[PDB]
């Protein structure tokens, strides 16, 4: 005599993934924040090939992506072409 039980549920994506994404065949990162029907903050990928895709945000390749998105540091040498022109 089983009646409906209330279970855990989230904003149900257009489609999820078994395979790890290439991160060279990445072409924008879209995010759906809490209060989207989602109890937690879930990165929605566009390839290249125009495949839309939420995955895990705490995924550990998907981490040097959230990595590629902000700056991690800055170099540059500026410096003047050293010709020692010498026959003599």
């Known amino acids: ?6 279970t ?32 937690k903050t879930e990165v929605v990928i566009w390839t290249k090939m125009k495949k839309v895709i939420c995955v895990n945000p705490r995924a550990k390749w998907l981490q040097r992506l959230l990595r ?7 170099s540059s040498t500026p410096q003047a072409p050293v010709s020692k022109r010498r026959a003599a």
Do not use: F, M, W
């Open 1 to 6: 005599i089983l009646e409906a039980h209330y």
């Open 8 to 39: 855990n549920l989230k904003c149900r994506c257009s489609g999820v993934i078994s395979t790890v994404v290439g991160l060279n065949i990445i072409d924008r990162i879209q995010v759906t924040p809490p209060g989207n029907g989602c109890p």
């Open 68 to 74: 590629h998105v902000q700056s991690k540091s800055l």
